[PDB]
């Protein structure tokens, strides 16, 4: 799995509040989160089927 799917999500330093998803690795699920809007970590996904695609594993 990529060593950044295990990290939590990270918001960010910007103001806004856009829905992105990350890999909850101890769920084995897509879940929500607010981004603000710059400076992404790559467990970061417009998506759920992103996230699973990405990080759900072999």
């Given at each position: 799995?990529?060593d ?10 910007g103001?806004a509040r ?9 769920a084995?699920?897509?879940?929500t ?7 992404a970590?790559r ?5 759920a ?5 990405t990080?759900?594993?072999?």
């Amino acid at each position: 799995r990529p060593d950044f799917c295990l990290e939590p999500p990270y918001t960010g330093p910007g103001k806004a509040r856009i829905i992105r998803y990350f890999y909850n690795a101890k769920a084995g699920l897509a879940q929500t989160f607010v981004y603000g809007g710059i400076r992404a970590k790559r467990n970061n996904f417009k998506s759920a089927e992103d996230a699973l695609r990405t990080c759900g594993g072999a």
